[PDB]
Amino acid sequence: VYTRWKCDRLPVFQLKLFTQEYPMHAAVGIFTIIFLWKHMSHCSEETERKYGWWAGYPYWRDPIARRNETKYKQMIINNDVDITHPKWTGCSVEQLEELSRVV
Amino acid sequence: SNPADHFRPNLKALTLYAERQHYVDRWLHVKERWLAPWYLPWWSPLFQLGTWYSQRSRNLFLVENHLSYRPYKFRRNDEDRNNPY
Amino acid sequence: MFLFFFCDLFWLRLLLCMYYCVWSRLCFIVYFNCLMLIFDFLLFCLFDLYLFVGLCLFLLLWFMLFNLYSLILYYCITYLNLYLLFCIVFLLYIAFLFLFCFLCDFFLFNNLLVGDSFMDVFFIRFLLCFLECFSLLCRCLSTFLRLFCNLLSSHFLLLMFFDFFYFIFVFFFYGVFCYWFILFIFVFCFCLLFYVFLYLLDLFAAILQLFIFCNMILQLIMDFLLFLLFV
Amino acid sequence: LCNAASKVQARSAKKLAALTDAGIQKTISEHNANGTDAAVSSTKRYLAEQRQLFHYRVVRFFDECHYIISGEYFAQYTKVNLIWDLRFLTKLVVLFLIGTVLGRQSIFPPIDPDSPLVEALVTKVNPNY
Amino acid sequence: MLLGGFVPRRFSQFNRDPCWMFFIFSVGFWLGEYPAMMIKYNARDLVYDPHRYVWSHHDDHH
Amino acid sequence: VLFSTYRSSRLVSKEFLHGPVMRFRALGEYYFQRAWNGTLNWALPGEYRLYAVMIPFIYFYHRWHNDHTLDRDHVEKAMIMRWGGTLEDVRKLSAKDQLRVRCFTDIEKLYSAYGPKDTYLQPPGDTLPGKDFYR
Amino acid sequence: VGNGPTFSTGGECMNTCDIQNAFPMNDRGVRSSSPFQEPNTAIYDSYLAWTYFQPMDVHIEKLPAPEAKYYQRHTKKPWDVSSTELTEIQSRKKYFQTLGYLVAFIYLYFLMPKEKSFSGLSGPDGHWIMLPKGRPELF
Amino acid sequence: LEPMSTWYLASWAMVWYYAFFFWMPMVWTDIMVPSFVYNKLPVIHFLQEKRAEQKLRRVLDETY
Amino acid sequence: YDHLASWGKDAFLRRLEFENGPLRDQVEAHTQRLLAERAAIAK
Amino acid sequence: YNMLVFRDPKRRPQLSEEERAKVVVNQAEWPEEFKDFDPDDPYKNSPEIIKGMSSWNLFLWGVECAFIYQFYELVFPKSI
Amino acid sequence: GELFVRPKLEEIPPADQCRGFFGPLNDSLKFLRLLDIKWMMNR
Ligand SMILES: CCCCCCCCCCCCCCCCCC(=O)OC[C@H](COP(=O)([O-])OCC(O)COP(=O)([O-])OC[C@@H](COC(=O)CCCCCCCCCCCCCCCCC)OC(=O)CCCCCCCCCCCCCCCCC)OC(=O)CCCCCCCCCCCCCCCCC
Ligand SMILES: CCCCCCCCCCCCCCCCCC(=O)OC[C@H](COP(=O)([O-])OCC(O)COP(=O)([O-])OC[C@@H](COC(=O)CCCCCCCCCCCCCCCCC)OC(=O)CCCCCCCCCCCCCCCCC)OC(=O)CCCCCCCCCCCCCCCCC
Ligand SMILES: CCCCCCCCCCCCCCCCCC(=O)OC[C@H](COP(=O)([O-])OCC(O)COP(=O)([O-])OC[C@@H](COC(=O)CCCCCCCCCCCCCCCCC)OC(=O)CCCCCCCCCCCCCCCCC)OC(=O)CCCCCCCCCCCCCCCCC
Ligand SMILES: CCCCCCCCCCCCCCCCCC(=O)OC[C@H](COP(=O)([O-])OCC(O)COP(=O)([O-])OC[C@@H](COC(=O)CCCCCCCCCCCCCCCCC)OC(=O)CCCCCCCCCCCCCCCCC)OC(=O)CCCCCCCCCCCCCCCCC
Ligand SMILES: CCCCCCCCCCCCCCCCCC(=O)OC[C@H](COP(=O)([O-])OCC[N+](C)(C)C)OC(=O)CCCCCCCCCCCCCCCCC
Ligand SMILES: CCCCCCCCCCCCCCCCCC(=O)OC[C@H](COP(=O)([O-])OCC[N+](C)(C)C)OC(=O)CCCCCCCCCCCCCCCCC
Ligand SMILES: CCCCCCCC/C=C/CCCCCCCC(=O)OC[C@H](COP(=O)(O)OCCN)OC(=O)CCCCCCC/C=C/CCCCCCCC
Ligand SMILES: CCCCCCCC/C=C\CCCCCCCC(=O)O[C@H](COC(=O)CCCCCCC/C=C/CCCCCCCC)COP(=O)(O)OCCN
């Protein structure tokens, strides 16, 4: 005779279990998952340094800085960003050359 | 302190980082790709389910006029109480 | 931020696969009351009052695979976080509460207004209703808080006592060869007694806490069940 | 101080009477009759036998060496022999480590004069130890 | 549930069942690791780190 | 029509890997399928020998993981911080010196809250290096 | 006699269980551990009592084989899977799952490094993903 | 205390959500329902034997 | 359960077969007599 | 008897005193493993799993493994 | 707890019998029934 648990394959039984046996629980769980990934999925660099490392943050090599450096280099190279543009520096290119000659 | 440190997961393998802007934009592109075709009319429940709530939430954000300051969600340092910037 | 990690149950999953490829009878259940809600015969309920049995059984198995085996040194309770337990209890409790609320029977809440018509409605009965509605949510919070605090305190105490025992055993056993050997033997016997007592207490407390955890959920369900009499 | 001694003697006497080994009881009775010590006699018999079996041990060692070298030992190798060999290897490792510690007469390796840990030696609380 | 099974009467019987053989081996490890720590960490030639005051976990967690 | 929803749609023959599977089931069934092996909610069996075997094994592999993966991080941090603040500085030491340092870390662990506090608190007048030694 | 298991009991004593009437009682007054009739059923007393049945060589008058017409029911359906077939399927599945879990356990507890090491000799320190590519207008 | 922390709470809770949504069905089909069917078998066998005896008894009682 | 035949019987299984086998009455009588004798000696 | 928390199961008597007294005990039919059977020590004559492997030998094996675990780095130290 | 049976049309008391914060809002004060929360609760 036919039974869901014995005759249906696992994915089918999973859908049946969470749709005709525990639909409200599945709905609430999905709601909570969305909330968690909407409000509890971020960590600042300072938070990582304080609590993000098992034995403590290794300032002697500063892996966060290396990670950010790789990130920004990748973005600049892939997106063809001109980091010498006045908006990034706040001054014209000629003024930048003057500053380079000064310092 | 040391006893408190025993209460941590012991099988951490990898940590990945992604900006909210980047993956939100990618998700929007996916949604536009799947909701673009002609055979899904704008009046279908699927299209409205995809679009209306997001539009409403973004409108609520735009209409917001708060007298207080909300610090940037993704600052480099959010642990200092006396420095919202 | 996306952290990839694994639970501490992989060996236990292997054992479950090895030992439960064939069927076995189950006759001992931590929370048996989920199976017997009605004690007077001819009473029956039109509500799905046995819906909690499956979730109860799975929750007991999961929490037992974690909490009971955590007494073994260096075994990790992977889920031991306050807000994660809040999420679990939120799921179960709010799901059942919304099941009762989706029924769209407002008379079901008549019992929230505590007291009789003799009591003043605004200054007594309404305030009691406010307190009872508050108490439902407080019951959810207390359930998850109790489960978290018991585990945390028990394991803190075990860790501290184990550290003390290691210290005295390693750095003061030489007194067995000295003239103050009787003091060390007394202390060592006391430490052994406390060790056994702590382990027994934790073993009992884990099962008791799981029983109470399931009892809270079943109490939520029972508070809104109405039984008809067969005629 | 006397009650405790009497209690210990009574307990040991009960345990001695309890054992149901014919040889042990016979030896105990004979030595009690003669007033001699059974345990010391057992020790002397053992040492005499071992003194007379030394060259038997040597012959057995050479026979076992021939048995191993000839390959007959490995022909009938089983899992039990594997367990025994693992036990043997573990004892060899532990004995090598203990021998090293005794040979250098120190649990830890000695510190070289050019090491930065020499300060630790200089700042000993008790130079005698 | 602790209902039944082989139960050695005394130490000498632990070798009458493979599972209890493994158990007594493990008990040997457990109890024998303490004497080893006594010998190793109460040794005459054990020396505290000269730079133990350069850094400590007490600094870091504070 | 593409995939069956029924478990009865077999993908292999009934005799596929029969021998190894039967050996695996023999291993599973010999100690577990017994009257006295009555479990408590599937987690705590009644057979004593299951405890006698599994408690040591679980402890052993957990301890190996802790010693070689988790505590090693703290040990390496202490070595790096106390002897230069860099990995190369530690590697400038010999294996014997590193052994001494690591065993001192073990000592600190074993005292923990009960050992002498001079292991990390410098008494006044002590001649050993302080916290500003490498700064 | 062999060493095979019998009908599972769950560690329960059938002389005091809630369904004791479902278990036949023998001459000695010990209820069976199974729906079958057992002559040598016993009860053992640990912390809790439990019923045990010891298989033995016993001869039973065997009624001759009936015809297939009177006991075979050909009502099988496409969804139907017999208990024997289910046992076979589950045995194979659990064998493969056990092997996979064994490999996972070995890797996790003996090969997998922990992330974010202080020294940097083992494990990853993390990195960013989903970064934009080929979108100059984005900056 | 990490038990009081929230900086990786979502990834942490994914363990519970995976256990609930993906492992519970497997435990349901492979362990729990089988055990309860096994528990059911004896009483059903007894009741059906009694029902068959009742049918035979009724068959005999109608003869005269 | 032919696949289990190779495993044989361990000490506990042999004890159970001995106590609950065809010789169960003899073992029960011997055990009870021995226990009664020990109880009498204790008193 | 007990070994820590593990208690040895005991079979309940099934015969009455009258029936029991009429039973004739013949240990010649008993297996050699169980002769002079004692409920307080049923495994006294039980064979060893490995001939010559004592319980003390296994205990000592574990002790030696622990000593190796703690002392190997003292003889063969390795660099970070 | 127990089953709830709605009152019959004849078992419902008249509105004039209900009391407000201070007193019954009978004729000439009926329209104040809308504003008195306690009267609505009692009703
Ligand atoms: C008539 C034909 C006769 C033919 C005769 C042929 C005879 C010779 C043999 C033939 C050759 C062998 C055939 C296969 C044998 C397999 C083993 C076996 O026998 O198993 C028993 C059994 C034999 O079949 P059966 O018993 O006859 O019938 C089965 C029943 O009918 C129904 O079964 P069920 O429903 O009850 O259960 C099925 C399944 C439940 O159902 C499923 O799981 C199916 C669905 C799973 C989906 C998972 C992926 C989802 C991803 C997200 C979605 C993506 C969407 C993408 C969309 C498009 C994007 C563009 O159950 C399970 O999951 C439990 C069993 C799991 C087995 C253990 C697996 C790990 C073993 C590891 C061992 C090795 C370790 C490492 C060793 C290293 C050494 C150094 O097979 C199964 O149970 C099937 C298991 C299938 C599991 C699939 C998992 C896939 C995971 C990897 C996915 C990779 C994706 C990559 C994507 C990359 C993108 C970049
Ligand atoms: C091609 C797929 C379909 C394309 C689209 C089709 C047309 C539209 C469909 C309907 C759209 C609904 C729109 C929202 C309705 C209202 C709800 C709401 O507020 O939503 C907020 C937000 C959506 O944002 P929005 O309101 O549209 O506006 C954007 C805002 O600017 C953002 O503002 P915000 O502040 O809220 O933003 C924060 C963040 C917030 O984002 C979140 O909180 C994400 C939450 C995800 C919830 C997932 C629900 C299903 C859970 C199933 C159970 C899992 C148990 C745990 C398992 C753990 C281990 C895997 O939002 C996002 O970045 C949104 C990204 C959403 C990505 C969804 C990816 C799903 C992956 C599922 C993986 C399952 C793995 C199972 C493997 C098993 C193998 C055996 O999140 C969601 O709606 C999440 C649910 C989305 C469901 C999509 C349809 C089903 C899934 C199809 C893809 C399956 C991929 C499988 C990959 C497998 C890899 C192995
Ligand atoms: C960039 C670097 C790489 C990483 C990229 C990642 C990309 C991420 C995208 C963004 C995602 C954002 C959100 C992340 C949230 C994470 C949250 C989280 O972790 O929560 C904790 C939570 C912890 O859960 P749990 O309690 O530990 O249980 C989950 C376990 O999986 C165990 O649970 P269970 O046992 O219940 O699971 C069912 C299990 C049932 O049991 C089994 O089936 C047994 C096996 C278990 C396998 C799974 C366990 C894994 C153990 C560790 C790894 C094993 C060794 C790997 C070796 C790697 C070597 C480098 O069955 C399976 O696992 C089905 C799969 C079986 C595969 C069998 C493959 C056989 C291949 C044979 C080939 C033979 C070839 C022969 C050729 C011959 C030629 C001559 O995680 C989850 O719930 C799952 C999170 C997953 C989220 C989706 C991620 C996206 C998918 C990534 C796939 C990457 C594939 C490419 C990798 C290539 C190598 C580098
Ligand atoms: C830095 C380098 C320094 C190097 C310095 C130089 C090194 C030496 C170089 C050479 C020097 C010249 C040669 C001198 C040789 C002297 C030894 C000798 O010949 O021995 C043979 C001699 C027997 O010869 P015999 O009289 O001709 O025998 C006739 C028959 O052959 C009899 O045959 P048998 O059948 O009787 O055979 C068994 C007999 C023979 O066995 C032996 O041969 C034993 C091994 C002989 C060598 C022992 C050397 C001892 C040197 C000091 C310790 C070093 C470690 C020794 C390790 C031994 C491990 C077994 O067993 C015994 O002797 C048993 C002795 C133990 C009795 C245990 C009774 C305890 C009762 C406690 C009750 C307390 C109640 C208090 C109630 C209070 C209420 C208020 O036995 C002894 O002298 C035994 C001495 C045992 C001393 C043990 C001290 C241990 C440390 C104190 C205890 C701390 C822990 C416990 C505290 C508990 C709290 C109270
Ligand atoms: C170190 C600091 C520690 C602080 C600790 C604080 C405690 C943290 C506890 C975390 C663990 C426990 C979490 C339990 C769950 C909490 C749930 C919660 O409050 O989430 C609310 C939040 C509220 O969402 P929200 O925050 O996005 O609200 C949007 C409101 N505006 C736009 C004005 C900003 O829910 C979610 O995050 C999920 C939202 C999506 C799912 C629901 C969609 C349907 C909504 C229906 C109504 C509106 C649309 C119209 C009708 C439908 C039309 C189709
Ligand atoms: C239903 C009730 C069940 C009760 C079971 C009671 C078990 C009694 C155990 C007696 C002592 C056992 C000692 C084992 C020694 C192992 C080796 C060792 O070194 O360990 C030392 C370890 C730790 O000892 P330690 O702390 O002294 O270690 C010193 C190590 N240093 C100095 C480095 C820190 O011992 C333990 O942790 C043992 C505690 C056991 C507590 C009981 C756990 C019960 C729950 C798990 C049951 C598992 C059953 C699985 C069955 C299959 C399921 C499908
Ligand atoms: C539906 C496809 C339409 C277009 C035609 C594509 C043909 C591609 C060539 C395929 C050659 C190999 C075929 C092998 C037999 C496949 C049999 C099959 O489908 O079995 C499904 C079976 C599952 O069986 P059950 O769920 O138990 O139920 C089955 C009975 N109800 O699935 C499997 O085991 C996987 C088998 C995969 C075979 C390859 C399928 C490739 C499909 C490609 C489609 C896309 C177009 C390809 C064009 C190719 C041009 C050269
Ligand atoms: C080559 C070895 C020879 C062995 C001979 C041993 C003879 C010893 C006899 C006297 C022993 C007691 C001495 C009392 C004082 C000891 C003080 C002490 O700790 O000494 C350590 C030496 O201690 C050790 O290393 C060993 C400690 C104890 C070891 C225990 C041995 C094994 C015990 C097994 C126990 C198992 C259970 C048995 C129970 C029986 C008893 C109840 C060195 O001291 P310092 O160098 O001054 O301080 C160092 C700090 N910078």
Author numbering:
A (entry chain i): 2 to 104
B (entry chain q): 14 to 98
C (entry chain a): 1 to 231
D (entry chain m): 16 to 144
E (entry chain r): 1 to 62
F (entry chain f): 2 to 136
G (entry chain n): 18 to 156
H (entry chain c): 29 to 92
Lines quoted from the article behind this entry:
Mitochondrial ATP synthase consists of the soluble F1 and membrane-bound Fo subcomplexes and occurs in dimers that assemble into oligomers to induce the formation of inner-membrane folds, called cristae. Dissociation of ATP synthase dimers into monomers results in the loss of native cristae architecture and impairs mitochondrial function. Here, we report cryo-EM structures of the intact ATP synthase dimer from Trypanosoma brucei in ten different rotational states. Although overall dimer architecture varies among eukaryotes, we find that subunit-g together with subunit-e form an ancestral oligomerization motif, which is shared between the trypanosomal and mammalian lineages.
Using masked refinements, maps were obtained for the membrane region, the rotor, and the peripheral stalk. The membrane region includes eight conserved Fo subunits (b, d, f, 8, i/j, k, e, and g) arranged around the central proton translocator subunit-a. For subunit-b, a single transmembrane helix superimposes well with bH1 from yeast and anchors the subunits-e and -g to the Fo. In our structure, the lumenal half-channel, which displays a local resolution of 2.55 Å, is filled with a network of resolved water densities, ending in a chain of five ordered water molecules (W1–W5). The presence of ordered water molecules in the aqueous channel is consistent with a Grotthuss-type mechanism for proton transfer, which would not require long-distance diffusion of water molecules. The distance of 7 Å between the last resolved water (W1) and D202a, the conserved residue that is thought to transfer protons to the c-ring, is too long for direct proton transfer. Instead, it may occur via the adjacent H155a. Instead, the position of bH2 is occupied by a fully ordered phosphatidylcholine in our structure (PC1). The e/g module is held together by four bound cardiolipins in the matrix leaflet, anchoring it to the remaining Fo region.
